[PDB]
From a paper:
Representative writers of lysine acetylation (Kac) are E1A-binding protein p300 (EP300; KAT3B)8 and its homolog, CBP (KAT3A), which can transfer an acetyl group onto the NT lysine residue(s) for all four histones. That is, p300/CBP reads H4NTac at the bromodomain pocket, rotates in multiple directions, and rapidly writes NTac to non-H4 histones within the nucleosome independently of the DNA sequence.
By preparing CBPBRPHZT (residues 1084–1873) protein corresponding to the same construct as p300BRPHZT, we also determined three complex structures in which HAT of CBPBRPH is oriented toward H2BNT (CBPH2B·H4acNuc) or H3NT (CBPH3-I·H4acNuc and CBPH3-II·H4acNuc). In all the structures obtained (five structures of p300BRPH·H4acNuc and three structures of CBPBRPH·H4acNuc), their bromodomain bound to H4K12ac of H4acNuc at the inside of its pocket and to the minor groove of the nucleosomal double-stranded DNA at the outside of the pocket. Collectively, these results suggest that not only p300 but also CBP can acetylate multiple non-H4 histone NTs by rotating themselves on the nucleosome with their bromodomain bound to the acetylated H4NT as the axis.
Author numbering:
A (entry chain K): 1087 to 1117, 1122 to 1244, 1263 to 1554, 1616 to 1638, 1651 to 1698
B (entry chain H), C (entry chain D): 31 to 124
D (entry chain G): 14 to 118
E (entry chain C): 14 to 119
F (entry chain B): 12 to 102
G (entry chain F): 19 to 102
H (entry chain A): 36 to 134
I (entry chain E): 38 to 135
Write the structure that this text describes.
Amino acid sequence: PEELRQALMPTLEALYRQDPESLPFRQPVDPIPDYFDIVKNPMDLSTIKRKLDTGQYQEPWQYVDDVWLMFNNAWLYNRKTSRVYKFCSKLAEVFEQEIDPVMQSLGYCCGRKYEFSPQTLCCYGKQLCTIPRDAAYYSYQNRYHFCEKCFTEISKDQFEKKKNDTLDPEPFVDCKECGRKMHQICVLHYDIIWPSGFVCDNCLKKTGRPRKENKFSAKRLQTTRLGNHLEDRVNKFLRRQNHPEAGEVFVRVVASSDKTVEVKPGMKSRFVDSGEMSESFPYRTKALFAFEEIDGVDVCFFGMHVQEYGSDCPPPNTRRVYISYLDSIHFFRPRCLRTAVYHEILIGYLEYVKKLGYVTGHIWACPPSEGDDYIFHCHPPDQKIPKPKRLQEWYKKMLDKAFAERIIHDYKDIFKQATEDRLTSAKELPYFEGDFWPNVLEESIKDLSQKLYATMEKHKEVFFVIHLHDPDPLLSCDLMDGRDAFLTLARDKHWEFSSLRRSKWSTLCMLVELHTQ
Amino acid sequence: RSRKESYSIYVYKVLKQVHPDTGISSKAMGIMNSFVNDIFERIAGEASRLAHYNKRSTITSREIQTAVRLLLPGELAKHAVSEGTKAVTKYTSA
Amino acid sequence: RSRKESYSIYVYKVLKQVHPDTGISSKAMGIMNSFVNDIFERIAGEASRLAHYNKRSTITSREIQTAVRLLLPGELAKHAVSEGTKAVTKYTSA
Amino acid sequence: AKTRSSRAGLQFPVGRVHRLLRKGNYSERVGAGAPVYLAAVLEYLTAEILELAGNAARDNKKTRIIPRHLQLAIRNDEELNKLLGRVTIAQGGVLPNIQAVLLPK
Amino acid sequence: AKTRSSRAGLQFPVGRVHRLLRKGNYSERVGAGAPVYLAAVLEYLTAEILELAGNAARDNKKTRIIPRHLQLAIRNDEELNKLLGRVTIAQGGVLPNIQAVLLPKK
Amino acid sequence: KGGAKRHRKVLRDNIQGITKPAIRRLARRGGVKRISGLIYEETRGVLKVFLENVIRDAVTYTEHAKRKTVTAMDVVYALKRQGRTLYGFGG
Amino acid sequence: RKVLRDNIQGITKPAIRRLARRGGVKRISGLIYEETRGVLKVFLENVIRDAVTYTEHAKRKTVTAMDVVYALKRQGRTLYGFGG
Amino acid sequence: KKPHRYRPGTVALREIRRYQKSTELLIRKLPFQRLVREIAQDFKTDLRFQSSAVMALQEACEAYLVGLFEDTNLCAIHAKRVTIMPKDIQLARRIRGER
Amino acid sequence: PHRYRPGTVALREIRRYQKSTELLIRKLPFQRLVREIAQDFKTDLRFQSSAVMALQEACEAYLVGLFEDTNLCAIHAKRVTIMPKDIQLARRIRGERA
DNA sequence: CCGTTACCGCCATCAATATCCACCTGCAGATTCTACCAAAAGTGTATTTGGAAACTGCTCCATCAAAAGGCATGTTCAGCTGAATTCAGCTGAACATGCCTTTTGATGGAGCAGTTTCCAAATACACTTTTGGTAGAATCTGCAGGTGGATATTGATGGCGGTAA
DNA sequence: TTACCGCCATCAATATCCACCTGCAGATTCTACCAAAAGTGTATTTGGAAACTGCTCCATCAAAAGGCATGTTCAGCTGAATTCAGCTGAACATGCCTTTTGATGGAGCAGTTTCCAAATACACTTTTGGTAGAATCTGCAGGTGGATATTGATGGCGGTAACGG
């Protein structure tokens, strides 16, 4: 008890030192008759002090859990605009700033009570329906979720009625030598990589045994010509910038499969049944990702989904590339060169597809919806999603920089493309899988040319058409054959990207999964 | 309840000479009284300094004229000197 | 010739007390004379204003002490008030 | 018979000024014409500021002199502003002045 | 046969300070201890300024106090500089002071 | 919540008592169009300093008059002796 | 007596350069010097007139250093070493 | 649907005009009174204050701050800027000579 | 031919004139200017040598102070060369102009 | 090839807003009138005195001479500093949202002031003694000024190293 | 395979430090003088210490309300990067006029004597400005009704241009 008291007393004193932030929490809350109806375990700083002085703590994780439970109770009962909430937030910041060195002196990598953030709840009822925060839902096996509106619109008694506020605490692993309980995410320990067990960093330093090399790194992934070109261009640009914090960046193509997009029934009846336009279009879809070595750990930070309609594809899709999905994580080092690295990756991809003989590139500049993830699950709360105008300006910078390098010929909005090409029928418009235009054509069908012209004049600023003027083998990856599989596996395994440590853990997990395929 | 000396009713009279139909608020009148007190203190202090410098134990109208010339700006000092000279001449001939 | 009083001998004695082997030039002597005269004038004027403010017609050690506190900053004021208290105590002790 | 202010053609109290000069410890002796001269100067200054404040109030559609009018009168005249450059007028405010660069276009 | 200056144990003239206070027209009356107090304050300030001037002269390998040493002493002491912030010392000069930007920027 | 909402909330240390909109308005009266985020507290400190330039002197007056109440006349004297003479509080 | 004129040019370019060097100025534009001269002239017009006001008040025709000291003290430019 | 929004500076200029055409106090009475009481407590315990003394202190502080702010605005304009930064305040106080 | 880079001799002069206290303005031109200004205000005036010396010393002190303020103002404007706008701003903040 | 549509820039103008003004009207505050009286203020008389005039001793202020060397004056070259231009990260401006702190009014007593007593302490002044200015001559002494050489300071001269075509 | 910008290394031109030594105006040491203060010793007067007490008004506390503190979005403010015309610093030749030492006529500063108009100290009579209470008057602070530039934004048009069939 004396060791724990000596270690943990300075943090509690620092919390007490906060004036007036600590004043409301120095004594147990004495009812506000509804305080006990919300807070089932009312606790305060004096309770910590008496438990620590009495030696009621077997190990410091219980102490920190009590601290964080106190903070949670204060944040729950008090509203956001209340100054008590501000006091609790300041106390939490002070505790976060002070706790880590004390644990590192005690042999622990951290103290903070890490609890998994609420994941995106994709309701299994109406399509694209999500369950927001503090919204009630029905759960089956913690896997099948339905909102109240969809659940009522549909045995029903077996589905558990829950609320979208479940914070899952992170698991723990025991060090085989010292026995200290460590966060699995913080120490990045995975049983598949290290079957011999977990050994903490302090034990490794004290015994002089180096940590075993990771055999499932992004560097060891299968290499491809497009990925190699992207990696080479990114590394050359980083070396030209000569930033000390700019680590090596690895780009690997993980999926490459041939698919076919089918014409929807309305447009098929209007143009395919007469034999004027093909019933299907073949293409090759590719999924690649970018990894950065931060602190000797691979971090996945940027990846795309693309569709490549080759020269064998029937018109108007012949010799085209289309960007279906892309995502990014802001933890790239340095932050200033993150945007430039994304620029170099996109420019290298466009240069490669130009070298392959592709003619036109297509980009849709619509940002993801609020609470929706494209590829990376659980984006950090501080990552501001760009608005459509900001994304359009970013793509304008893309295209200006690309044209400055003579790599592209020109770029336009799709309305300018149609006006200059003098398109007369909807059959001449490119048809891509999951694209916005195929839905608009079916909606208009359910006269067509003028409606398409009006919608195109309305939405030209969102679509970019790029004028430009396969040696990579097919890669069968069921996990990366689309965005649904990865987003489902991350949700089922809590592979969040909301923080640098969680991003590292998720990257390690997906690298192991890809290597084990 | 001791009486507090103030130039109030005098300055108000001066107001009636310059603006018969215009009044003055209590705060503005306090501003005016403070102004006159400050100017009186400055002129008296400069006159005392001039008297001390010349080893003179008496302050006369010449010392006041020198003080107002030193303190007041050009046309203000000229008009103040003219008014003081006129008042002294009127008092002497009275 | 009319005698012109100055603090020359007292400043010289103080310098000998604080620096036995260090001299002082005539120009520096004039600087020190002007310095002590200016401090004298400032303290006397502050004490006079203090006495006028409280309707007091006598300048005692308390007004001088308060004027020194108003004028000298911090440690200078503290040492000056200590020396003044010691001096007045010694003077009244005989 | 006649007050000293009346004999000197002034509204300010000559006797009060003389008494204040006597009690102010400015000099051992005070001349006879010194209080008259000082009262005349004070009366002239008060008349100037009062007429300026009345003009400001008239321009402000007002018939009562307020500290705002006194501040406007004291600030807009260069000599009067110089005389009270180290003086703050309570509840007087400041002159309307916007920097050229801060102006739009 | 004891002088009031020696009675208080001061080097500055108490009688001269009293006479100047009477002559300066500061009040109708002046206390007995006021000149002693003022002389003590003046003597302390003179002692401080002379100590600093002698130190500055010693730093300059000089045994005679010159107005340059007086300026160096007055401007190097924060309290004394604040005391004479609006005072010019003849033939005293200014403290050696060069801004960082004024220094070479190689 | 519970506890108290008056006389027990004690916060906003004296210098922080001056609200951000107060400094903003003071700058607006000074004709300044744009304010840096670091100005406010800095201005507070400057304002802070100003008070020890005045109030202490007024206190030095208050102690001399053997009084325990600070009067407006002592404030006027302190402002005048600092070169900041104020009118209207000489009554 | 001779009516002196155009004596402001006696405040010479190297003199202003030396004054700026004492003031810590490494580089001087060409428009400073004349401007500086004017400022100096203004400063003269600020002080000497007051000294004249002293000299006229003493019924004297010779300007003494004591009047200059008085003018500087009343203008807030107190100077030591020349009396007072 | 595109709510009305004034451009940065228009409302600022309107506030400039409004606060230059008015003379009312800007600092709230209670916090300033508390600050003054604390400052007095730092020098002499158990002091009392007149309402007129507090009003005079507030008026003097507001006037001094207005003068400092206009000086800093001039300083910022001198540096080809329109936003005052603490170095402008430092330079203004240095030229004023307070320190 | 040996030549120093611009600024080196300037800094040398800075150090030399900050280390010494000799008068920088020539005696006779300044005395002539003082006499001209005096006769502009009042004719038939006479001047003590000490009066002229005190006036010149006060002018030198005011000028070195104003030049220091101008140098700080110029440094604030990211410049090392003083321009009349700097001295005008310094005088305006000092209250000598507005 | 010249022609439609996007972009830059102008600008003519529906529309929400703060505000100047046309008008109002109730009230805190300014203005008018009677009365009281201690507080000043004006006049009279004898006394004291600061400074005016009258003459003059005398310090230093103004003026003319001559030399020449310390800088003033003018010229030239380019080092690099101030000034103009672009643009992208980003810090503040404008604003809707929420609440809480400030403002206003009412109420006990901590001390601000008015009265009275009386004594340690302040002037008034006539001597007596000590002492700070200070004319004058004599000896001492810190540093102004010139010499010479060891010591940093500055700048780009020899060459070594990519490197960029 | 030739000039061109960088860097660490030496090296030459040059200002700096500094110890040393000599002539002297200024700093320090006595002799004597001496009138201006300083101090001691009575007489007289009074600023204020001290105690008791009525009257302010200041701290404390209640509710009513006019405000302040946060998070969001983004136009535009700002500072880094780039380029360049030209301004002034460094150097130098020529000579200008300021400084120093000297002397001199005298306008003018200041000491000394005389003495009177002016300031002072009461003593008395006269007016009068400060204060308290009643009651009348009103300038203007907001409150309500248009309503008006005004400026952001929606939009139309003219000029540039940019690439396509």
